Write a protein that binds this ligand. Structure first.
Ligand SMILES: Nc1ncnc2c1ncn2[C@@H]1O[C@H](COP(=O)(O)OP(=O)(O)O)[C@@H](O)[C@H]1O
Lengths: 134, 146, 240, 250, 232, 238, 139, 228, 240
């Protein structure tokens, strides 16, 4: 099934009007046939978002959630460190869900400076072995 | 998935999980019908599974403690009669590495000698024997201390 | 297989799990903390009582090195007494060659040499014991330090060890590092340790106190628990 | 921490020391030596390991080393591992001269080295000596003494010895030409030359690719003689020439 | 400490030492090195090239002479090179105390290979992958020697080491004939440096020591550009 | 089970199974209960043997005037640390001409057993010592374990089903601090005889008794010394 | 292994099942089982007890007269020359094999058959034995 | 799984030592008896061939004057312990001027029983039977290889050990005399011996305060054989 | 390629590669410390940053920089357990140097000692190889500027632009064409490029309190620990 994928891009044909976008776990096992341009046109990826960029990743998390007006965005950004957008958000929403366990509606960052802090600490236990070859 | 080839059969079936991920990550519709997962151990898997879409809650269940350990078999032995003195601290104090399921079998062999004793009811001297009767190991010998 | 066996042999991740196995072994220990104000350094430890188990006051994890320096340990109790006795008699060497107090910053270097060397040799193992080091003097000042099984010599104005650690030291930031008076901070930290380190799991527990600073004139001993009963005089009303 | 050593000292399920077999293979690989009968003299022959003609060869004897003025020894095995035993036995024979101020009979000297050779075998799981060497010389009692060292600790000494798997074909020739006095040093020269001619696979039996040494008993010299290549050239040429006269039976 | 000192490197079923075979593999994967013993003295060249432009030849040297009249080169790792050099400098005093005179070339090779062969039977690690080239001038005729991990040493006029040691030597066999001079030895040293070049003919990519009967002379890369600029 | 290889290697949970295996031999020993009141202390042990005619091996043995002890674990290593304990007894009896407070002495026993736990090839020592001692501050009862963790208690026990003794102790032992020597002795067998299987004695030669106090010197009590202790009580109700 | 195989346990268990099927549950069937390997080491020692328990034959190496007893059975058919003698050759030779002492006659079955002669000659059989001697010595 | 040779057991105990305790079961059979008139004992020499010389094999040795000993399983290691303990009995006579007590042989042997260790060397499989008479009268003592000491009125070792003691439990009583202990024991001895009873099969070992040493003498054992 | 315990100890592979110390190369990434060094004409600069878990972090124990002597100083990377012990060994080598030799140390021979020490520990695998990276500066007469870096592989090399750590591959690769060329080096010029190389990977432009930056120029040869005031003056000086 790989041989055709090669030959389809190995043409004999011009596919230029199609844009092939490729992403997966690792860019390693693909064998060098794919790894060259043509089949793989450019190299783009993601790394751990900077806390400066994570400051913005929380806004789009903090936007849909309304609470009491007490917020320091850099608090969670300076407390909770080295995460991902979903990892932050989901736990940030989980913190709101962990804080709403008390049945009270609006929650200050207090619980979140605790929950997101403590909960992601458990989530960073399985952050092990996430660093993969290029 | 292993990591490098060659080869795993579930390496193709990991994509079922990756589609399970693609349905919980790249696809919206998975929102309803909340799904839970379990293993005997979390040892080695695809570690990227951390998210709300993929697995989120990680709750380590330790060895049951004397709170549960006294109560577990107490609720397992509430099905059966008891000579109305049992410490339940005796086990709970002396329970070390004992699993909550082993405590289910502690009352069994204790009740099994109670069977072959022709006894009407189970007593702690019969209970506490079943502690060291099921675990651990031996027989070997008792000597040079006695 | 078994890259984690020997301490002198590395692992594919670039470390040794013998240190990591000893790290999380300290996590099973109860509360071991320290905090330093301008006037001194407050110490406290929560004793876990399995059943009775024995008389009150026996084999407390709070230890002592010199009149100005003391030990608050965690992890295995015997090897804690070991490194406590080693640092105990080590101050006598500095007292013999010089005759004044041993600086705590460079006293932790000795324990750093002992713990690190035990991680060097394959015959011996690393020690699974951590501890806290703190002190105050008029010619020195307040220095608190923290050493773990990895042999790291470092310190904070306050720190925690055990099950509840990062959650216990979070709200401690309300207590100031300088402006606060550690005499009153005794009960101030007592309300934290009483509320934190949840006792619902094991109902039987006990609390110890100690202090060192200027009020005792560079003397490290236990501020009396039987006097004024400052521990539970407040914290009983803190959780309600 | 007990699983790291390979237990070379400890006994093996085969009923004997297992490393001694691979030790006899160490000497039994690329090692080529022999011995000649002793009648009013003795000689030695070996194989020169160097195939490079650009080498200097300013060290005179290559594989043969001189332990004593009147007594030397042939060696087969790893070079430096043998060179450790050269100076060691040289110092053992020197401390004997340091004792009696008089040369050393080879008997107690070889047994002394055998007691040293068993050191690596009997303790610590040490690697046994991968070198087995010969013995030559002269004494006041038995005259010319030709001995042999074994990795098992025995002295296998004979007046005609064999070293190496290729030299194992010469043992049949040694007993086919076997005589006693009778044999002249010249007869042993042609004997060992035909030994190499049968064993060594070198075409025409090149003289510069194999080592040859001799010994004589003189009063009070008793010289261990390193020979120029001139007489060995004409020796092997005159040898195969005599073999050209030995094929006349057809 | 432990202090096991056991011999764990043992005989292969063929009789050789597999670890020493790994040692000669570290030498075979070593940097190109060559030296030439001809007439008056010996010439050493080899190669040194930094991993980037951040390094210079003016401070750290791959060639440190053992004595004023005795130079040395080698292949393999530098850390273990300076280790055996440190032992060579110390051992030079054990000789000089009794003799009160300089030392012959082969006199170092005897005791160095003995300690090296001792380090084989001895516990821990082995001679590793450092194959040293010892040279010097004594008794009017200089010398060039090289040993191996197992301790086997041989004498010759010239040899190639490191990578492509067989190809460069077969080129030196046809070029070197009869005897050569110091200038001719340096000339064909540029030829064997141009074999694996890379960095031949450039003063900063190589270092040239030269032994003479008047004693060893270590010239800066300045003289390497003097003779070869203008190379050949 | 390659993680249990040596005391050097730590279990995946950060523990050593070698100490846990030494705790087994401590529990495999005979049931023995030491105890102390506010004034005087008493310690009771259990003698056992192999065959009928084989004499019951004594557990309680004298060490110092104010120090009685129980024993369990390997008798060879027990006598090793017993003669080593005599070396510790002659320390202050020689230099200071007065005995040693036992608190700091057992701490030296902990440092003595620390080296065999650390280095490779060294093993812990199974120890069943229940140490009673008297300084001027009153009695001390110290349990001993291969982990060298000692508890100062009014009473404790080590042996087979020795926890059932403690369960009978607590509510009773709180009132046992008041009582004097005699009943404080038979309170020891008020533990042992419950820890003993109900189908057999509890004989004269299988029990060990000793009594020590601040003003009282320790002595081994067995055979005819157990006559007042056996009489005056009743059998356990079936 | 040839082709594709693994791991050890599946090859370990196919031998473990080989005995466990032969163990067996519960098989009277014979097929009297003869088994051999020249290296006693590598086999799992548990194969002995279920069966065969009583017998593992020890093969002694040939002695001097056994080589004499063995040799003539071959040369019985191959006619020897006048000077050919069984004893002296194998008397001097040591640690042979029955296969060799059988196959040492084949080398004379070349040259004598190259001359197409029904008769063995010891002048060759001596000299040609060097080839089989070279076969054991150098090979 | 061979680990350190010093490793404990999870049950548990020392691996290598307990394995040698089971190795005692293949030794010779010897039965001592404690009697107010004296402590007797006997052993089976276990003839391995008719060429055996009777006086060359003895399983009982004499430590002190009135103190005897026996061997089990492996021999030479115990034979070293014999004379090495005799040096301590002579050092006992140095300061104390008198004979070493039979109970103190425990502290003279069982304390040093296993000192073995990897650094600064292997355990023993031999159990000793200590006979003797101290100032308190006859004493029969027995020790194991691990150093655990116990006082036994009758003790059997080696093969017949479990079988001999199980059978001898009935015939033994507090009133057993000397001559009765000898002739009632050889009934068990003739049951636990494979070869036909003769002078070379078994030897007697006795210690008495008034008759010694004795030990025992030959050609008298034949007079007891006809009294079978 | 592996025979027995080979994977867990130090010997040579078929290619002669070491398995243990290649784990020590990834033993530097613990903590994420990045130290860059830029040595100019008359000066030598060190720049390193830190991570702050919380406000309890002490400012006195912030400094990761070490000072060999009053003239010369050091900077370490990787796990701090091996760094503190290896620095104390440099204290022993420098104190013994001035004692017996009695003159200025070239800092080249000190790097020769540490290069052999980490090598001797790489020799025998039964003690920890000590994969910590050793980086220093130097001050010596007639030789101009001096910077030497002792790598855990057992060799010593250092020059004008040299650095070691996780992210130094990127930054120093930019420093290849950036440094020279012709570029002349002054004080503020060497410190500027020390900031820009940090601005390649990070570009955070955070306040000076976070960086640990040493610098040594030759006027008074004594090296001085920098105060955040002058770095703040250089931070506003690099903003155009
Ligand atoms: N002139 C060229 N020379 C070499 N490679 C080229 C050239 N032009 C295109 N390519 C590369 O070759 C690839 C297609 O080559 P092709 O031979 O079809 O692949 P394959 O060899 O795998 O069948 C393209 O991805 C392209 O990047």
């Amino acid at each position: 099934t790989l041989m055709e994928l090669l030959n389809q891009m190995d043409g004999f044909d011009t596919l230029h009007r199609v844009k092939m976008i490729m992403a997966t776990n690792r860019p390693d096992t693909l064998d060098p046939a794919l790894l060259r341009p043509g089949r793989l046109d450019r190299k783009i990826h993601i790394d751990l978002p900077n806390e400066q960029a994570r400051l913005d990743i929380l806004k789009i998390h903090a936007g849909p959630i309304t609470k009491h007006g007490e917020i320091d965005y850099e608090a969670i950004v300076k407390l909770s460190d080295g995460f991902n957008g979903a990892d932050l958000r989901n736990v940030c929403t989980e913190a709101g869900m962990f804080a709403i366990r008390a049945d009270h509606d609006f929650v200050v960052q207090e619980d979140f400076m605790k929950a997101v802090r403590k909960v992601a600490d458990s989530k960073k236990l399985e952050s092990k072995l996430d660093y993969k070859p290029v | 998935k292993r990591f490098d080839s060659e080869k795993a059969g579930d390496r193709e079936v990991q994509r079922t999980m990756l589609e399970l991920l693609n349905q919980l990550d790249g696809f919206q519709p998975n929102t309803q019908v909340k799904v839970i997962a379990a293993t005997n151990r979390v040892d080695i898997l695809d570690p990227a599974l951390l998210r709300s879409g993929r697995l989120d809650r990680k709750i380590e269940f330790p060895m049951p403690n004397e709170e549960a350990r006294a109560r577990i078999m107490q609720i397992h032995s509430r099905k059966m009669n008891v000579s109305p003195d049992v410490n339940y601290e005796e086990l709970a104090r002396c329970t070390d590495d004992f699993n909550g399921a082993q405590c289910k079998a502690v009352c069994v062999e204790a009740g099994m000698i109670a069977l072959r004793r022709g006894a009407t009811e189970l007593t702690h001297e019969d209970y506490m024997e079943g502690i060291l009767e099921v675990q651990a190991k031996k027989k070997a010998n008792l000597q040079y201390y006695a | 297989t078994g890259y984690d066996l020997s301490a002198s042999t590395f692992s594919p991740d670039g470390r040794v799990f013998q240190v990591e196995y000893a790290m999380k072994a300290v996590e099973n220990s109860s509360t071991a903390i320290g905090i330093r104000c301008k006037d001194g350094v407050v110490f406290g430890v929560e004793k876990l009582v399995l059943s009775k188990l024995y008389e009150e006051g026996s084999n407390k994890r709070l230890f002592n090195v010199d009149r100005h320096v003391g030990m608050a340990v965690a992890g295995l109790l015997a090897d804690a007494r070991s490194l406590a006795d080693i640092a105990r008699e080590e101050a006598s060497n500095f007292r013999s060659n010089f005759g004044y107090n041993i600086p705590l910053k460079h006293l932790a270097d000795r324990v750093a040499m002992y713990v690190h060397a035990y991680t060097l040799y394959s015959a011996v193992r690393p020690f699974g014991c951590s501890f806290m080091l703190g002190s105050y003097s008029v010619n020195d000042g307040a220095q608190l330090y923290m050493i773990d099984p990895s042999g790291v010599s470092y310190g904070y104005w306050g720190c925690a060890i055990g099950k509840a650690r990062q959650a216990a030291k979070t709200e401690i930031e309300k207590l100031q590092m300088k402006e606060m008076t550690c005499r009153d901070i005794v009960k101030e930290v007592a309300k934290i340790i009483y509320i934190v380190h949840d006792e619902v799991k094991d109902k039987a527990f006990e609390l110890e106190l100690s202090w060192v600073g200027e009020l005792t004139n560079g003397r490290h001993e236990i501020v009396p628990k039987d006097i004024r009963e400052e521990a539970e005089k407040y914290a009983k009303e803190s959780l309600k | 921490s007990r699983r790291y050593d390979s237990r070379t000292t400890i006994f093996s399920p085969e009923g004997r020391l297992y490393q001694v077999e691979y030790a006899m293979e160490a000497i039994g690989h690329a090692g080529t030596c022999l011995g000649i009968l002793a009648n009013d003299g003795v000689l030695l022959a070996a194989e020169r390991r160097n195939i490079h003609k650009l080498l200097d060869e300013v060290f005179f004897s290559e594989k043969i080393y001189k332990l004593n003025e009147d007594m030397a020894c042939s060696v087969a095995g790893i070079t430096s591992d043998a060179n450790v035993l050269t100076n060691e036995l040289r110092l053992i024979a020197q401390r004997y001269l340091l004792q009696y101020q008089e040369p050393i009979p080879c008997e107690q000297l070889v047994t002394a080295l055998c007691d040293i050779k068993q050191a690596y075998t009997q303790f610590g799981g040490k690697r046994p000596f991968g070198v087995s060497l010969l013995y030559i010389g002269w004494d006041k009692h038995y005259g010319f003494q030709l001995y042999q060292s074994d990795p098992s600790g025995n002295y296998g000494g004979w007046k005609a010895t064999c070293i190496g798997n290729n030299s194992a074909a010469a043992v049949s020739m040694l007993k086919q030409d076997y005589k006693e006095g009778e044999m002249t040093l010249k007869s042993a020269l042609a004997l060992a030359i035909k030994v190499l001619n049968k064993t060594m696979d070198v075409s025409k039996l090149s003289a510069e690719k194999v080592e040859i040494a001799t010994l004589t008993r003189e009063n009070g010299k008793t010289v261990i003689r390193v020979l120029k290549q001139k007489e060995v050239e004409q020796l092997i040429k005159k040898h195969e020439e005599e073999e050209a006269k030995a094929e006349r039976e057809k | 400490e432990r202090g096991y000192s056991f011999s764990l490197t043992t005989f292969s079923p063929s009789g050789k030492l597999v670890q020493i075979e790994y040692a000669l593999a570290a030498v075979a994967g070593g940097a190109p090195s060559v030296g030439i013993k001809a007439a008056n003295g010996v010439v050493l060249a080899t190669e040194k090239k930094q991993k980037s432009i951040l390094y210079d030849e003016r401070s750290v040297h791959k060639v440190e002479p053992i004595t004023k009249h005795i130079g040395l080169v080698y292949s393999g790792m530098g850390p273990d090179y300076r280790v055996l050099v440190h032992r060579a400098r110390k051992l030079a005093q054990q000789y000089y105390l009794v003799y009160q005179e300089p030392i012959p070339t082969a006199q170092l090779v005897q005791r160095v290979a003995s300690v090296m062969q001792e380090y084989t039977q001895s516990g821990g690690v082995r001679p590793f992958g450092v194959s040293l080239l010892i040279c010097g001038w004594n008794e009017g005729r200089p010398y060039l020697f090289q040993s191996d991990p197992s301790g086997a040493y041989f004498a010759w006029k010239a040899t190639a080491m490191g990578k492509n040691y067989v190809n460069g030597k077969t080129f030196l066999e046809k070029r070197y004939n009869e005897d050569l001079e110091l200038e001719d030895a340096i000339h064909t040293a540029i030829l064997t440096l141009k074999e694996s070049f890379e960095g031949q003919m450039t003063e900063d990519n190589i270092e040239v020591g030269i032994c003479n009967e008047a004693g060893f002379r270590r010239l800066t890369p300045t003289e390497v550009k003097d003779y070869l600029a203008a190379i050949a | 089970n390659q993680y249990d290889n040596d005391v050097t290697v730590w279990s995946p949970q950060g523990r050593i199974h070698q100490i846990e295996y030494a705790m087994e031999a401590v529990k495999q020993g005979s049931a023995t209960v030491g105890l102390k009141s506010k004034t005087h202390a008493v310690l009771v042990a259990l003698k056992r043997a192999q065959s009928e005619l084989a004499a019951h091996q004594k557990k309680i043995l004298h060490v110092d005037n104010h120090i009685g002890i129980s024993i369990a674990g390997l008798t060879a290593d027990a006598r090793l640390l017993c003669n080593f304990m005599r070396q510790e007894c002659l320390d202050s009896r020689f230099v200071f001409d007065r005995p040693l407070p036992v608190s700091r002495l057992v701490s030296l026993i902990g440092s003595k057993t620390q080296i065999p736990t650390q280095r490779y090839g060294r093993r812990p020592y199974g120890v069943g010592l229940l140490i009673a001692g008297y300084d001027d501050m009153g009695p001390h009862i110290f349990q001993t374990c291969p982990s060298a963790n000692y508890f100062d208690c009014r009473a404790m026990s080590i042996g087979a089903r020795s926890q059932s003794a403690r369960t009978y102790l607590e509510r009773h032992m709180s009132e046992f601090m008041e009582c004097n020597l005699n009943e404080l002795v038979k309170h020891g067998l008020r533990a042992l005889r419950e820890t003993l299987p109900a189908e057999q004695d509890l004989t004269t030669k299988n029990v060990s008794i000793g009594i020590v106090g601040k003003d009282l010197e320790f002595t081994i009590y067995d055979d005819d010394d157990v006559s007042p202790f056996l009489e005056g009580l009743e059998e356990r109700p079936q | 292994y040839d082709s594709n195989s693994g791991g050890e346990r599946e090859i370990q268990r196919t031998m473990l099942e080989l005995l466990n099927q032969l163990d067996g549950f519960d098989s009277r069937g014979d097929v009297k089982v003869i088994m051999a390997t020249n290296r006693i080491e590598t086999l799992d020692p548990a194969l002995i007890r279920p069966g065969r328990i009583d017998r593992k034959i020890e093969f002694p190496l040939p002695d001097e007269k056994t080589k004499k007893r063995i040799f003539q059975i071959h040369t019985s058919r191959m006619t020897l020359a006048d000077d050919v003698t069984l004893d002296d050759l194998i008397m001097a030779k040591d640690d042979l094999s029955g296969a060799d002492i059988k196959a040492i006659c084949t080398e004379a079955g070349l040259m004598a058959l190259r001359e197409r002669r029904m008769k063995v000659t010891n002048e060759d059989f001596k000299k040609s034995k060097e080839n089989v001697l070279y076969k054991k010595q150098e090979g | 799984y061979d680990r350190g040779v010093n490793t404990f057991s999870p049950e548990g105990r020392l691996f290598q030592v307990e394995y040698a305790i089971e190795a005692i079961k293949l030794g010779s059979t010897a039965i001592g008896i404690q009697t107010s008139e004296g402590v007797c004992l006997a052993v089976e020499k276990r003839i391995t061939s008719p060429l055996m010389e009777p006086s060359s094999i003895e399983k009982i040795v004499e430590i002190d004057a009135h103190i005897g000993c026996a061997m089990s399983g492996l021999i030479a290691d115990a034979k070293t312990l014999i004379d090495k303990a005799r040096v301590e009995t002579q050092n006992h006579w140095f300061t104390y001027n008198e004979t070493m007590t039979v109970e103190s042989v425990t502290q003279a042997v069982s304390n040093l029983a296993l000192q073995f260790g990897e650094e600064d060397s292997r355990p023993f499989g031999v159990a000793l039977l200590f006979g003797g008479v101290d100032e308190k009268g006859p004493q029969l003592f027995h020790m194991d290889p691990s150093g655990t000491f116990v006082q036994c009125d009758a003790r059997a070792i080696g093969s017949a050990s479990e079988g001999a003691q199980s059978s001898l439990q009935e015939v033994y009583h507090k009133s057993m005399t000397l001559k009765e202990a000898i002739k009632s024991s050889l009934i068990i001895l003739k049951q636990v011996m494979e070869e036909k009873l003769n002078a070379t099969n078994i030897e007697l070992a006795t210690v008495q305060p008034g008759q010694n040493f004795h030990m025992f003498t030959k050609e008298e054992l034949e007079e007891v054989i006809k009294d079978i | 390629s592996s025979a027995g315990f080979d994977r867990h100890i130090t010997i040579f592979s078929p290619e002669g590669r070491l398995y243990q110390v290649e784990y020590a190369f990834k033993a530097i990434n613990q903590g994420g410390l990045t130290s860059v060094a830029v040595r100019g004409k008359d000066c030598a600069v060190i720049v390193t940053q830190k991570k702050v878990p919380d406000k309890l972090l002490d400012s006195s124990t912030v400094t990761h920089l070490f000072k060999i002597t009053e003239n010369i100083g050091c900077v370490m990377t990787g796990m701090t357990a091996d760094s503190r012990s290896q620095v104390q060994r440099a204290r022993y080598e420098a104190a013994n140097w001035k004692y017996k030799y009695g003159y200025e140390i070239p800092v080249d021979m000190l790097c020769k000692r540490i290069a052999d020490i980490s090598q001797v520990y790489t020799q025998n695998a039964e003690m920890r190889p000590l994969g910590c990276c050793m980086i220093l500066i130097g001050i010596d007469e007639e030789q101009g500027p001096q910077v030497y870096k002792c790598d855990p592989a057992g060799y010593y090399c250092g020059f004008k632009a040299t650095a070691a750590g996780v992210k130094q591959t990127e930054s120093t690769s930019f420093l290849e064409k950036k440094v020279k060329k012709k570029f002349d080096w002054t004080f503020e010029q060497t410190v500027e490029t020390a900031i820009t190389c940090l601005s390649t990977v990070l570009s955070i432009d955070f306040k000076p309190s976070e960086i640990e930056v040493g610098v040594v120029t030759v006027e008074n040869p004594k090296f001085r620990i920098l105060t955040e005031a002058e770095i703040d003056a250089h931070l506003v000086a690099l903003a155009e």
